[PDB]
């Protein structure tokens, strides 16, 4: 890898600088280099990895949606414009799929070394998320298998989080939020999405009394995102 | 927009 | 070039799609491919070229400024953090300089084939702009020569625009705005900056009566930018 | 911020 010659600590320092500069491609390359040093990631480092790739793939997904919408309109009384829209949508799609495939890092070897609930749930949620992004663009013979890979990753994360974390844990809440979105947007299961979001919200509500002021702010922030989705869906 | 951002 | 096998018209079509998708690196690569076909650019195509590279280099400049500010703070009672901030600022700087050097396109061979005032002033203003971006990061033995290259390009564009274009022409106005910024920010000549912005504004004001409603909106928009700078500088 | 945007 191109980061093989840079110190782990220097990669982490530069990932933080890249975040401040809004250079998320650089940030992701730095964090990929840090992961490939082979050591486990701290909580802060896991967040740097997630922030970097979420921003990179977020831009790709936004562009894919714009191009897909144009492509769909061109396939209606529409005037033929040639293969260019499909070609360029395919180009963006392939790059997106490449980034999801890279986030490989989970399989080699972050997840197998993650033993604590906070690390293991974090990585399995990530695995669900990036299979979900692959599912968003999938149209072929593997679409069902991609969806099931997302589901399986989310389900293992959910099982661990329910056994090992309090209902207000922000990682547990963000996992439940995203698995609920998976049910709604990917799995054609709006009722499961709503049930999961509602039960997650209610159980967190009942546990807020145990929290410090700072933890209360952390948990209620994600609870509001659950409520926002429930408001949209009901 | 719906997922954790 | 990687775009050598794609049709000129397909490159232009994909540049427009990339703009809609906010994929400005792609947009710039497409427009570079179109320029390298060797044909002159239409007015719309010149704008696509400019939009693409302005967005690319704009992100690089914003990141360079963040990193430069951190580097300056580290060089004060500050704690030594190693070479990483300088290294990463240098990395972003080198990439920025590479993009400016690419925008090469003007020299091979856009400017020498540009005979009409609207094309020639547009390209010479671009040449001034990208030498100005090189000047913003220059610290070495060529800083003075870089500044003079920007000045010389702007001056030739100004001479042509004053002889061949009305004072309300949007290209003429945007050139005057940017040359005024060059005087203020690069050449240590705030009085020349203010004089140029004021004279440009006043002469445009006196010519607005000749314009259609749509041309009036185009010209007054850039006049407001001149006024905004004058308000800041006085 | 000052130049043509
Ligand atoms: Ca080492
Ligand atoms: Ca051809
Ligand atoms: Mg290396
Ligand atoms: Mg372990
Ligand atoms: Mg090619
Ligand atoms: Mg010509």
Numbering used by the authors:
A (entry chain A), C (entry chain A): -4 to 71, 73 to 99, 101 to 231
B (entry chain P), D (entry chain P): 98 to 102
How is this structure described in the published paper?
The 14-3-3σ protein, which has multiple interacting partners with specific peptidic motifs, was used as a case study. We have observed this phenomenon first-hand with human 14-3-3σ, a protein which has several hundred known interacting partners in the cell. For example, the 14-3-3σ isoform (but not other isoforms) specifically targets p53 and is associated with tumour suppression, making it invaluable to determine crystal structures of the target peptide with the correct isoform.
To address this problem, we present a combined co-crystallization and peptide-soaking approach to obtain crystals for any 14-3-3σ–peptide complex that may exhibit difficulties when crystallizing under our optimized ‘sigma’ conditions. To demonstrate the experimental reliability of the method, we considered this approach for peptides found in the PDB where co-crystal structures were published with isoforms of 14-3-3 other than the sigma isoform, since they were not able to crystallize under the standard ‘sigma’ conditions or any of the other hundreds of screening conditions tested. Not only does this significantly reduce the production time, but new 14-3-3–peptide structures that were previously not accessible with the 14-3-3σ isoform, despite screening hundreds of other different conditions, were now also able to be resolved. All models were determined to belong to the orthorhombic space group C2221 using Zanuda. In addition, the method retains the robust, stable, high-resolution and well diffracting features of crystals originally grown in the sigma screen.
